[PDB]
Design a binder for this molecule. Structure first.
Ligand SMILES: *[C@@H]1O[C@H](CO)[C@@H](O[C@@H]2O[C@H](CO)[C@@H](O[C@@H]3O[C@H](CO[C@H]4O[C@H](CO)[C@@H](O)[C@H](O)[C@@H]4O)[C@@H](O)[C@H](O[C@H]4O[C@H](CO)[C@@H](O)[C@H](O)[C@@H]4O)[C@@H]3O)[C@H](O)[C@H]2NC(C)=O)[C@H](O)[C@H]1NC(C)=O
Ligand SMILES: *[C@@H]1O[C@H](CO)[C@@H](O[C@@H]2O[C@H](CO)[C@@H](O[C@@H]3O[C@H](CO[C@H]4O[C@H](CO)[C@@H](O)[C@H](O)[C@@H]4O)[C@@H](O)[C@H](O[C@H]4O[C@H](CO)[C@@H](O)[C@H](O)[C@@H]4O)[C@@H]3O)[C@H](O)[C@H]2NC(C)=O)[C@H](O)[C@H]1NC(C)=O
Ligand SMILES: *[C@@H]1O[C@H](CO)[C@@H](O[C@@H]2O[C@H](CO)[C@@H](O[C@@H]3O[C@H](CO[C@H]4O[C@H](CO)[C@@H](O)[C@H](O)[C@@H]4O)[C@@H](O)[C@H](O[C@H]4O[C@H](CO)[C@@H](O)[C@H](O)[C@@H]4O)[C@@H]3O)[C@H](O)[C@H]2NC(C)=O)[C@H](O)[C@H]1NC(C)=O
Ligand SMILES: *[C@@H]1O[C@H](CO)[C@@H](O[C@@H]2O[C@H](CO)[C@@H](O[C@@H]3O[C@H](CO[C@H]4O[C@H](CO)[C@@H](O)[C@H](O)[C@@H]4O)[C@@H](O)[C@H](O[C@H]4O[C@H](CO)[C@@H](O)[C@H](O)[C@@H]4O)[C@@H]3O)[C@H](O)[C@H]2NC(C)=O)[C@H](O)[C@H]1NC(C)=O
Ligand SMILES: *[C@@H]1O[C@H](CO)[C@@H](O[C@@H]2O[C@H](CO)[C@@H](O)[C@H](O)[C@H]2NC(C)=O)[C@H](O)[C@H]1NC(C)=O
Ligand SMILES: *[C@@H]1O[C@H](CO)[C@@H](O[C@@H]2O[C@H](CO)[C@@H](O)[C@H](O)[C@H]2NC(C)=O)[C@H](O)[C@H]1NC(C)=O
Ligand SMILES: *[C@@H]1O[C@H](CO)[C@@H](O[C@@H]2O[C@H](CO)[C@@H](O)[C@H](O)[C@H]2NC(C)=O)[C@H](O)[C@H]1NC(C)=O
Ligand SMILES: *[C@@H]1O[C@H](CO)[C@@H](O[C@@H]2O[C@H](CO)[C@@H](O)[C@H](O)[C@H]2NC(C)=O)[C@H](O)[C@H]1NC(C)=O
Ligand code: G39
Ligand code: G39
Ligand code: G39
Ligand code: G39
Ligand code: NAG
Ligand code: NAG
Ligand code: NAG
Ligand code: NAG
Ligand code: CA
Ligand code: CA
Ligand code: CA
Ligand code: CA
Lengths: 388, 388, 388, 388
């Protein structure tokens, strides 16, 4: 086994093909299935895995009441092969109410954060063992990606944040070799508020598209230089913006360097990637809530903040159906690196009041250089009929 | 690992021996078992796997109501080792309401079709990754085999159909190397309506026996030339015909080149294979519904459309018990290639009204050059007693 | 991987140590566990597996009513690693209401019999594929060991029986190389009625200790010569006899060559093995029913039919607790071949009327050259409290 | 594969980071989960496993009533990968109401004790086979560690005890090569009562920190010389003592050689390890019951029995939440050997009367040379709402 370098060009992408779907909530009406949220996908050189943060309970279980909360001592990172729903033989790979995972070509890293809000601990687990950990630095909800980290030549990078969700926070980028933190660069450049980064290998570096929870409905970009540890940051130029809430398409605007100051408060985790000067990007369909999910290409969307020329739109989840977090993951082909993305389909509280729980299922699409048609792939559980 | 070529002669077959049975519906009265249909078997060089299309629900689950429908966004391709029933730790290998799978000797291909009726997408998954996809070409329920595809020398072939179920449709044969569509030949020859092909390696080519849903109760044959991509087609000569509905044995007739025009409308998926000039073939026992299942040899049945000389009959499922789809799969021995076949045992709606669901179990027999006796191996669930 | 030869001496045995126990019925009061009977153990070169014949249902399942019957089309051979109870992810390795399994050092053989009483089929499955089969020869319940077969140098042997359970039957010994029946020797020597053999490698041959269902409460011995295919047969000399029913210890007698004619009708599957001129043997404690289970050494018990000198008695299951079938299996050590034995703990009908079902759990002991103490290891389920 | 020697220095430890947590009791309110106690962790060269002693029942199961008892014939040693909760596909690796496990680098040893109180049997299982066993020597509850054993150069050592829990007992240390007892040294040195040792490799030997159930609330130390089989023993000097019950911090005292005679009766399993002349140690927070759990360093705590200088305290389970047994396990890094520890979170009878059962979940922390913060990680099940 050799370390992954991802030193191959990015695949031609004409859009996305369906890849995976676990029907987790549907199964949980007649089965023992974990309550989760903040799911994500990452893949060893052979095959893909689905991760999520458990609420240390199954759905049809008294302990699923009030699983709307974000941080309890009972949350663990779940890990299965992709398409195996989180049943009772699912391995909890660490304790975590915030996490990130990646495989360097030899072994799995996990970055798992748990403990007190005001004094959390991040654990660094590599190859079945604990190799390091760091305390919260700013004593305000140390947190990380909720999607895959990225390793080049055996140096893995991950973005973490400590501080305010609605003010200046303290974001850092760690470099990790075999579970050992070998460096920490602090955030730099024009990105003002950075969270839940969706990162992908862009040889020789790593690129991330994050969530601005403060004053931006455009999404921050973070550029990580793996060799000299330098950081740069900015925003996705595209005039059609990827966060939620946001303004409508006719009213929205963006800026390559600053938050747009348009319904900037709050956000949702999401993703984008460059294709020459164009941007591929997913986003919720409904501008203010986590309803529906779409992907498209914005032509000149990576370089031109006035550009609002979308082509190749796809509905992933129709506008009347709930979506949630989404994020990138990268899969190596024979000749190129593909881009795929998962979407968290959230069900339950607070938005749906028919039940007491909050859970999710997932749907997963992958870059394609072939052709594709249309559809919608929602959660499809009936919360009127579920465990009363 | 080397690519499979199947460059070995076909085994002497004197009939079929019992191989596998999952009792899926019986287990589902006291267990968490998936609702499925369109099951099938395919085997890597070591061992066999059972696939089926899930309805994204378990049987004892509110979501099993109305699982009679064919295409929902919740259907996925299920995959276990043969004889492991589809429990909750079953891997969904892709999203699909129509599929085909095969192993080329190195890795698994899956061909998974999902999305809108009038604009479906076929995804091509090889070795744990998405390598290609194609849109529906005729915008009318792009669909495929519901049984194993076939790979020779690392070129896999699969038959797909788009268009009318009861008129001229647009059938194509794809050639796939490592998940990449490297060619598409369109259907040619005398076969007029072609669906749900049951294909097997017949070195140096591939042979398929399909379902004529339009004007034929005799079954179409499709001959696929793997090297030059040429296609030829015709029908199973045998005067005892393999589709259902059909006429009775005294009234039936057939034709080597054309549909017989005898209760041709509709059909059921099924299979046949040549043995010199004789044909081995399975079929439902009841001429008009999916009740019972039998296999026999028709002597001269491959070359002579007037020949109705059966020998070596076996009852697989007795005439008072429900059957369903059936299909071939091919297993490599030390010196020869064996032919085996699975039978879908369908239970529930519309035919059985005691429950609200529609599911299936499977039974699997294999070619034998030894001897065998008799029996019947039905589903054996009591739908009067099941999840009310 | 090389074929097993078992060309090592038998381990010193001073008695038996506890090895495994699955608590199958206890677990099945709060879990999805298979209904089984006729369980057994066999081991690949690395590790041990537990097999049993399923009733194609779980215990807490409507279909468990009337599982007292021996042959239904829903019975399959179950296979797990030893100590994993038969849950829903258990693999059914073939269809079978009678079976035998062994590993030759390279791959697993299974011998699986199913179908009509008066015309059953035995399937021979090797290395994940069907290689052969034979019909019933005497058209009266073709049946086999219900415990492991034995392979030396890649020739596996198995004992099968067709005919009367209470008269002369037709017993044969098959020789199988890679799933292919390469010879059939018919039973010969003084053994008059032979069933459910418990066989073990006794280099250069195989030795078996069977059940006389007709006129003998002493147990038949069958000696299988693997190279020239010759058979010899006789009975376990020991004056303390191993079948059930039997006479009491003060009244019993035996004979090295003939059935003893003492409560000979019926029997239970069981086992014995030679140790110089002494015999190690297990048996039910209660002389007339399947209650309790004991093991001991009878000094001179292998050569002297008048000898009733037991030493080293161990209670495995105390006399007030149900037992059932038992059988040998052989495990290779660094320098010697060990002998271990499993015991079927039967619960339910007809004997226990509190429930409608018939099932079993297992307990497994192994030869030891160290020391040991005492105890009892029954089923331990409360049938008064179980699934009403 | 080579034998483990652990010939690497012990890792710098500044405290402990969170590693694993199974939420076993929480899951068991809506799932089929085993009733356990006496859990523990041990790891093969690749990855970690969680063991526990089952009560041969699941929690939501009639047979969970009265699982407060310590020794029944239904208890087995459970084994999963760490973080997989004990579901129904969990392997029982042997019969046992007392056990110890370790991997020598090639294969697993298990030491499993079961049978009559006054005549128990220890079975020695190596590499999937029974290699040895010993009887109880003093006929009074032969028992062992309830945590991992230790192997150096293919010689594994384990500490066992037979005799009184509240008087002089007969403790021995066995040496085991490939499952074969190759020597037995009897306990020697100043340790007066020794139980449930927590052992770790301290090249070239093994060191253990045990429980004095008789007259000591300080913990015994046992030093095992692997090459010449010599034993020495004494007590943990530290003035803050690790057993429970114990006196408060202001009143407690200790002694390097003798039991302290302070609430010495009874105890709880626990652990400690040297760091120069300082001791790392865990213990319950509440001085008299198994409530809370803390770890700290006592400076000079290994050499100075008057020293009560703790630094680096961590709360693992807060003082209002139940704890239980805890023990060490050792994990090999690139350059050093790490120390990790698990904590049994006991729920149910006798202490909690809301239910009839007694079970546990686990939480697992590992040595870290990085930094960490704070929290509490209790069981988190609501016994008011659980299976009534
Ligand atoms: C079968 O499935 C395929 C693949 O999904 C569909 O083909 C896609 O259809 C979508 C939807 O219309 C196309 O996406 C749209 O592209 C528009 C581009 O406008 C034109 O300009 C280019 C010039 O380069 C021309 O080639 C082309 O003819 C276009 O006319 C955008 O304007 C669209 O955005 C606008 O519409 C959407 C709603 O549709 C709004 O929400 C937006 O905010 C905005 O106003 C959109 O991006 C897509 O490009 C097609 N892709 C491909 C690969 O062909 C088929 O439509 C479908 N067939 C059927 C029968 O359903
Ligand atoms: C134990 O199990 C074995 C194996 O299953 C059975 O043997 C088979 O029995 C079947 C059923 O009869 C045989 O199949 C039939 O073959 C007939 C051939 O007719 C004769 O011609 C040949 C000349 O080559 C002679 O060798 C032979 O003696 C025959 O007499 C066909 O005519 C049959 O089809 C007709 O009957 C069936 C109903 O049975 C109708 O549904 C058809 O539509 C049609 O009218 C049929 O194909 C089979 O060949 C036997 N196989 C083998 C390998 O021996 C035993 O019968 C069974 N024993 C018991 C006691 O149950
Ligand atoms: C701890 O556990 C150990 C191991 O299980 C026990 O030791 C065994 O005890 C049994 C039970 O008594 C012994 O088995 C018996 O052997 C008798 C032999 O008689 C004597 O002859 C030899 C001469 O070679 C002397 O060495 C020896 O002292 C004997 O006195 C048989 O006669 C017994 O059979 C009879 O008794 C049983 C009931 O016990 C009846 O059911 C029979 O039908 C028959 O009448 C029996 O076989 C065994 O050999 C011991 N084994 C070993 C290895 O030591 C301990 O007893 C136990 N300790 C406690 C306190 O429980
Ligand atoms: C974020 O999380 C970190 C890591 O958990 C916390 O830092 C630890 O805090 C604990 C709790 O106070 C410290 O442990 C304590 O150490 C004391 C040592 O006293 C002084 O002496 C040294 C000299 O070497 C000085 O460096 C240091 O400044 C100390 O002032 C002990 O006296 C303590 O024991 C006593 O207190 C506890 C209750 O706290 C009692 O139960 C005891 O019985 C006893 O009376 C204790 O051991 C620990 O060392 C810190 N560790 C590290 C690595 O920094 C932060 O507190 C936390 N931050 C927040 C905001 O929560
Ligand atoms: C589910 O959890 C909610 C939230 O705790 C419960 O409602 C609370 O329960 C407390 C204590 O019984 C009440 O006094 C409060 O009125 C509730 N608090 C809040 C903030 O709403 C509720 O009881 C639970 N429901 C079930 C069915 O278990
Ligand atoms: C199972 O599904 C059927 C089909 O949808 C349900 O029957 C329909 O329900 C609607 C809305 O309640 C009714 O208005 C219609 O009369 C029914 N439609 C058709 C086409 O039959 C039925 O309610 C479901 N049954 C259960 C027990 O859930
Ligand atoms: C369990 O199975 C038994 C055996 O079939 C059932 O009893 C029979 O049922 C038939 C048809 O209802 C009756 O007419 C007979 O009197 C019974 N036959 C025999 C031979 O006993 C019984 O109904 C089943 N019990 C349950 C609870 O399902
Ligand atoms: C749980 O087990 C307890 C302990 O055995 C049961 O209580 C005993 O049951 C016996 C026999 O019925 C009574 O005579 C005694 O009074 C009880 N003995 C003791 C020592 O308490 C109890 O019945 C069981 N409870 C349930 C719900 O099964
Ligand atoms: C702590 C701020 C952060 C917002 C950027 O909270 C996230 C918001 C969430 C959200 O917007 O859905 C849910 C996430 N589970 C949560 N993470 C944690 C650890 O609380
Ligand atoms: C779309 C036409 C085709 C008939 C040839 O339908 C098949 C018929 C079926 C049938 O005859 O049972 C059920 C199959 N699930 C269905 N496939 C789909 C995708 O609908
Ligand atoms: C068919 C005769 C044979 C007795 C030797 O029956 C066995 C007796 C049994 C018994 O004595 O328990 C149960 C076995 N399941 C049964 N096997 C079959 C196939 O019926
Ligand atoms: C037999 C004495 C020993 C105390 C040192 O008992 C242990 C005490 C226990 C305890 O203090 O919790 C529970 C353990 N399961 C038990 N082990 C056995 C085998 O009984
Ligand atoms: C978006 O979401 C909210 C959720 O309740 C809904 O009320 C609103 O109508 C939706 N808006 C649009 C424009 O679809
Ligand atoms: C065939 O199937 C139908 C199903 O209801 C049944 O009514 C009919 O009697 C059967 N016909 C024959 C000839 O067996
Ligand atoms: C043996 O078994 C039967 C089973 O009911 C019982 O009645 C009888 O008392 C037992 N006999 C002896 C001698 O233990
Ligand atoms: C310790 O435990 C007992 C358990 O009931 C409790 O009553 C007591 O208050 C606790 N003591 C302290 C000092 O916390
Ligand atoms: Ca925002
Ligand atoms: Ca037709
Ligand atoms: Ca008999
Ligand atoms: Ca004590």
């Amino acid at each position: 086994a050799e370390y992954r370098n991802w030193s191959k060009p990015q695949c031609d992408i004409t859009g996305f093909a369906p890849f995976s779907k676990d029907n987790s909530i549907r199964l949980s009406a007649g089965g023992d299935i974990w309550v989760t949220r903040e799911p994500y996908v990452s893949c060893d050189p052979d095959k893909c895995y689905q991760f999520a943060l458990g609420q240390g309970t199954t759905l049809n279980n008294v302990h699923s009441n009030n699983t709307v909360r974000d941080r309890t001592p009972y949350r663990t990172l779940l890990m299965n092969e992709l398409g195996v729903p989180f049943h009772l033989g699912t391995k909890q790979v660490c304790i975590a109410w915030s996490s990130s995972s990646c495989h360097d070509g030899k072994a799995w890293l996990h970055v798992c954060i748990t403990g007190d809000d005001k004094n959390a601990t991040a654990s660094f687990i590599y190859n079945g063992r604990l190799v390091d950990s760091v305390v919260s630095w700013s004593k305000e909800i140390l947190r990380t990606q909720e999607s895959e980290c990225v390793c080049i030549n055996g140096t893995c990078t991950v973005v973490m944040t400590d501080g305010s969700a609605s003010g200046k926070a303290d974001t850092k980028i760690l470099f990790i070799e075999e579970g050992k933190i070998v460096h920490t660069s602090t955030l730099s450049g024009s990105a003002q508020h950075v969270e839940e980064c969706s990162c992908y290998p862009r040889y020789p570096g790593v690129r991330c598209v994050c969530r601005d929870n403060w004053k931006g409905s455009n999404r921050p970009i973070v550029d990580i230089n793996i060799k000299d540890h330098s950081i740069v940051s900015s925003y996705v130029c595209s005039g059609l913006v990827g966060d939620t809430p946001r303004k409508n398409d006719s009213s929205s605007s963006s800026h390559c360097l600053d938050p747009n100051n348009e319904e900037g408060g709050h956000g949702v985790k999401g993703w984008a990637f460059d294709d020459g000067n164009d941007v591929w990007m997913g986003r919720t369909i409904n501008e203010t809530s986590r309803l529906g999910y779409e992907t498209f290409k914005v032509i000149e969307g990576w370089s031109n903040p006035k550009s609002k020329l979308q082509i190749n739109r796809q509905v992933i989840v129709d506008r009347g159906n709930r979506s949630g977090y989404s994020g990138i993951f990268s899969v190596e082909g024979k000749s190129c690196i593909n881009r795929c993305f998962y979407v968290e389909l959230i069900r339950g509280r607070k938005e749906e009041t028919e039940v007491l729980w909050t859970s999710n299922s997932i749907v997963v699409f992958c870059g394609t250089s072939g052709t594709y048609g249309t559809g919608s792939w929602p959660d499809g559980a009936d919360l009127n009929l579920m465990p009363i």
